[PDB]
Amino acid sequence: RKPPKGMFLSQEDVEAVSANATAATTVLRQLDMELVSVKRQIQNIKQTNSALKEKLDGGIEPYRLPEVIQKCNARWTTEEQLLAVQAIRKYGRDFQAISDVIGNKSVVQVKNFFVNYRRRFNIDEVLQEWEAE
Amino acid sequence: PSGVEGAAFQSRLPHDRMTSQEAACFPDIISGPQQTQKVFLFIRNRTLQLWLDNPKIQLTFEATLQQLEAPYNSDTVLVHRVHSYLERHGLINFGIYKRIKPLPTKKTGKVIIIGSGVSGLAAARQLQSFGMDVTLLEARDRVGGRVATFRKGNYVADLGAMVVTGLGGNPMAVVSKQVNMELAKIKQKCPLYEANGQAVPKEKDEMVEQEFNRLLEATSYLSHQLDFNVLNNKPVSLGQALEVVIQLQEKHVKDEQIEHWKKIVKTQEELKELLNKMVNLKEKIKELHQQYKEASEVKPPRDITAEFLVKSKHRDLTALCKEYDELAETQGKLEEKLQELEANPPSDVYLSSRDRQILDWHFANLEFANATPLSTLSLKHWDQDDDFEFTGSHLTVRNGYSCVPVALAEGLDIKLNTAVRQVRYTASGCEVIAVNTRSTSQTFIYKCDAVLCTLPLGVLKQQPPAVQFVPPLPEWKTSAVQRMGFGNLNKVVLCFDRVFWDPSVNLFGHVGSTTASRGELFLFWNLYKAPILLALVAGEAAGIMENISDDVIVGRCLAILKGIFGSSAVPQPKETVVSRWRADPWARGSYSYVAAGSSGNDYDLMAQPITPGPSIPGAPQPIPRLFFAGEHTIRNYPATVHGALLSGLREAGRIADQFLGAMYTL
Ligand SMILES: Cc1cc2nc3c(=O)[nH]c(=O)nc-3n(C[C@H](O)[C@H](O)[C@H](O)COP(=O)(O)OP(=O)(O)OC[C@H]3O[C@@H](n4cnc5c(N)ncnc54)[C@H](O)[C@@H]3O)c2cc1C
Numbered sequence: 110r111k112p113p114k115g116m117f118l119s120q121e122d123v124e125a126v127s128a129n130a131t132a133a134t135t136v137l138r139q140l141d142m143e144l145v146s147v148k149r150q151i152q153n154i155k156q157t158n159s160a161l162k163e164k165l166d167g168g169i170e171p172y173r174l175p176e177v178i179q180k181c182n183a184r185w186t187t188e189e190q191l192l193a194v195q196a197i198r199k200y201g202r203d204f205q206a207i208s209d210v211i212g213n214k215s216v217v218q219v220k221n222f223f224v225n226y227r228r229r230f231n232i233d234e235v236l237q238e239w240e241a242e
Numbered sequence: 243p244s245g246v247e248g249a250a251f252q253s254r255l256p257h258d259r260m261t262s263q264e265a266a267c268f269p270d271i272i273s274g275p276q277q278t279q280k281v282f283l284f285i286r287n288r289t290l291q292l293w294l295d296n297p298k299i300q301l302t303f304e305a306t307l308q309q310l311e312a313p314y315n316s317d318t319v320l321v322h323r324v325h326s327y328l329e330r331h332g333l334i335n336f337g338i339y340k341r342i343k344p345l346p347t348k349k350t351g352k353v354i355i356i357g358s359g360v361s362g363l364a365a366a367r368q369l370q371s372f373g374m375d376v377t378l379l380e381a382r383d384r385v386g387g388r389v390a391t392f393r394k395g396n397y398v399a400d401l402g403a404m405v406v407t408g409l410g411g412n413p414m415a416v417v418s419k420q421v422n423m424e425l426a427k428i429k430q431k432c433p434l435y436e437a438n439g440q441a442v443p444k445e446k447d448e449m450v451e452q453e454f455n456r457l458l459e460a461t462s463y464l465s466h467q468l469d470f471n472v473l474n475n476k477p478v479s480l481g482q483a484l485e486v487v488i489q490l491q492e493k494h495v496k497d498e499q500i501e502h503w504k505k506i507v508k509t510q511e512e513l514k515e516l517l518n519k520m521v522n523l524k525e526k527i528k529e530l531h532q533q534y535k536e537a538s539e540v541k542p543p544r545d546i547t548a549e550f551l552v553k554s555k556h557r558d559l560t561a562l563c564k565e566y567d568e569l570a571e572t573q574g575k576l577e578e579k580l581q582e583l584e585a586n587p588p589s590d591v592y593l594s595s596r597d598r599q600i601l602d603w604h605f606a607n608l609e610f611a612n613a614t615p616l617s618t619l620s621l622k623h624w625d626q627d628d629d630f631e632f633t634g635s636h637l638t639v640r641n642g643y644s645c646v647p648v649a650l651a652e653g654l655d656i657k658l659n660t661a662v663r664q665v666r667y668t669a670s671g672c673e674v675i676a677v678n679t680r681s682t683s684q685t686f687i688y689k690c691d692a693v694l695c696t697l698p699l700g701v702l703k704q705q706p707p708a709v710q711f712v713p714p715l716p717e718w719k720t721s722a723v724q725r726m727g728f729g730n731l732n733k734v735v736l737c738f739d740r741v742f743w744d745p746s747v748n749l750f751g752h753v754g755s756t757t758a759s760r761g762e763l764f765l766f767w768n769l770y771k772a773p774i775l776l777a778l779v780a781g782e783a784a785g786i787m788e789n790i791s792d793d794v795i796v797g798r799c800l801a802i803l804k805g806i807f808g809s810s811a812v813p814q815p816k817e818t819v820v821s822r823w824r825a826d827p828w829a830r831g832s833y834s835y836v837a838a839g840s841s842g843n844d845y846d847l848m849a850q851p852i853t854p855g856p857s858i859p860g861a862p863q864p865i866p867r868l869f870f871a872g873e874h875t876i877r878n879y880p881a882t883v884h885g886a887l888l889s890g891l892r893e894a895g896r897i898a899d900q901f902l903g904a905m906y907t908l
């Protein structure tokens with residue numbers, strides 16, 4: 110039913126080395142030349158990606174910003190109220206980004222802000238401005 | 243190997259069933275009730291058992307009946323039929339026995355036999371054993387034909403047949419008892435030595451051998467499963483099949499490599515895309531950070547919009563700094579993977595050239611066994627006799643195989659130096675025309691009821707014909723002769739004084755440099771008591787080495803023999819012989835092979851006897867007159883001694899049934 114171990118011969122590829130008297134050497138030379146091909150292509154991308162690595166040299170350590178740990182507070186000083194409005198205007202609905210930019214509020218605290226203040230800061234209107242972007 | 247059942251096996255018969263031959267002579271029984279048959283087989287099997295655990299003496303009907311146990315006693319005619327049948331078809335009372343009753347006073351019927359090869363001799367004895375008048379005609383000055391032993395002083399080497407290929411079912415088992423043959427086993431270890439004179443590394447040897455065996459299986463699968471047995475409406479050789487298979491491996495070696503390097507570049511390109519994303523994000527960062535710094539530089543107090551800017555810029559930056567790390571993570575995974583793909587590269591070659599050479603030795607060994615280039619063997623059929631090979635070790639005949647024909651030729655009318663030239667057969671009888679080999683002009687004429695042709699297939703093939711048939715042979719016969727293959731294989735005998743090789747090693751090989759000359763002296767044999775080394779010429783090489791003088795050939799041997807062993811240890815040889823089996827005109831080659839385009843069926847054609855046309859038109863159907871035996875008549879044992887023998891025995895049966903009648907079919 111099956112050829113010996115590690116010997117490979119499908120019906121198809123027998124017939125393929127039969128057609129002419131040099132399908133033998135033809136089929137074999139195609140791959141010889143198809144191989145040298147893929148090897149030169151490899152070399153290209155080694156050099157291409159080697160130059161791109163040189164430009165990443167330094168990582169981003171120069172532009173890294175110290176961590177800070179803010180203890181989520183429940184009250185909204187006028188200060189961080191105003192940060193919010195501006196954050197909404199810029200970030201739209203990115204509740205995360207807003208919670209970060211303010212620093213001391215959780216992502217839920219931001220959510221219930223939208224509703225609690227929707228009235229007093231016309232937040233609906235504000236989002237429409239961000240809409241146009 | 244136990245019981246009467248063992249005698250059946252030792253006589254190539256199924257203990258539990260009736261053969262088709264037996265059906266023909268005992269149609270009543272095989273047609274009959276189960277029980278009657280079961281009886282028959284025992285009577286048969288038992289009788290055989292008797293013959294063979296003592297084949298030194300005739301086994302009579304009474305002697306057999308003697309060892310009879312009921313209900314097997316009951317029927318005395320049955321026992322007689324059986325014993326007669328067995329005796330007729332040389333299953334018992336063959337070879338060399340002591341007779342009980344000296345021969346019948348008077349002979350009956352006259353037969354001429356062509357050739358005193360084993361096939362000839364076997365039948366001659368049988369016929370004479372059945373009291374016909376028999377005369378053999380040998381062109382040679384000696385019996386045996388392709389059994390040819392060389393003798394000088396204590397040097398004894400076989401140039402022809404040398405091996406008994408197992409004893410389990412072999413007739414020669416029985417002959418071995420009847421004649422003193424010194425049967426010695428063969429040690430399988432065969433060390434190889436490349437051109438340099440340096441053994442092949444044990445690791446290599448094992449791999450290539452294993453590859454070779456796989457390459458064969460390959461072809462068989464290739465033949466039977468993929469049905470790849472025609473190409474350009476020409477039948478496919480074994481050599482073609484191998485070439486094909488090899489290429490496909492060589493090809494698949496490449497296919498792997500390609501697929502592996504393509505897996506690399508697919509990843510190499512995923513990385514390129516990442517590295518861009520990375521490099522661009524680094525720029526957005528550099529520049530953004532700058533902005534944040536500037537926004538931070540604005541000393542307070544400051545209104546809320548300026549405050550917001552710092553925060554927004556601060557967050558926008560830590561956000562971009564997150565992305566980049568996720569990417570440098572992704573990068574490290576792809577980067578390590580790349581080096582692991584690079585770590586395990588699919589194999590570079592299928593086989594080297596130093597390999598391909600060693601492989602070519604294993605092929606030469608195959609061309610040796612079948613005595614022909616693999617380009618000539620039938621892919622479908624070359625190994626058709628593999629199912630009937632005997633059991634047990636292969637032995638040499640140490641004292642020279644010639645012992646066996648010579649033994650057989652005792653008390654036989656043998657005209658040596660009598661070359662048959664023409665064979666005429668008619669309804670009336672036949673006449674054979676020979677000549678003396680020494681004075682070709684001196685002419686002989688023999689008349690007989692029947693002729694038995696044991697002419698070698700090479701002779702039969704000869705064109706223009708060495709022997710002429712009158713009338714000429716039917717096209718069905720001659721076509722078979724054309725289709726069948728008659729190979730060649732040659733031995734070189736080296737008689738030294740000192741044993742300068744390893745005596746614990748029976749045989750060792752030498753690896754020829756090229757495919758073309760893989761046959762040349764590719765294998766050597768210390769198999770004899772004396773200090774004697776044989777060297778084989780096989781394959782394409784055999785045919786060509788038959789135009790090189792003895793001296794040159796021994797030159798080449800000695801040279802080869804100094805690589806392995808060193809110019810100090812290798813003396814000149816005292817006596818040397820080289821064979822030339824294809825040039826030998828009473829042979830025209832070595833032995834048959836199922837050539838591409840033939841089948842084992844042709845072997846059966848060559849055994850069919852020939853019946854002449856009637857003398858007077860509308861006269862009754864004649865009796866057949868011309869019969870055939872030899873190594874090429876026996877489908878299941880071709881190209882061996884035992885087959886030659888068996889073919890002789892067989893005809894002796896066919897002939898006697900014709901000319902003495904069969905009193906056992908009652
Ligand atoms: C090198 C070699 C090694 C072998 N090794 C083995 C082995 O190891 N084991 C094995 O089992 N078998 C072996 N054989 C095969 C074996 O030798 C044959 O199968 C067998 O001996 C053939 O017997 P035969 O009677 O069929 O033909 P032959 O033995 O040739 O007998 C036919 C006879 O006819 C004679 N003759 C030819 N032309 C004429 C003519 N015009 N007129 C009259 N007579 C003629 C011949 O001279 C010959 O004596 C080997 C053969 C060779 C060549």
Ligand SMILES: Cn1c(C(=O)Nc2ccccc2COc2ccc(OC[C@@H]3CCNC3)cc2)cc2sccc21
Pocket residue numbers: 404405407428610611612627636749834835880881882883
């Ligand atoms: C030449 N020869 C030999 C022979 O000299 N063989 C030998 C010599 C030293 C070591 C080992 C071997 C075994 O190697 C084989 C070689 C051939 C073989 O089948 C050959 C027949 C002929 C066609 N079908 C099978 C079996 C074993 C045996 C036989 S039987 C018929 C011919 C022949």
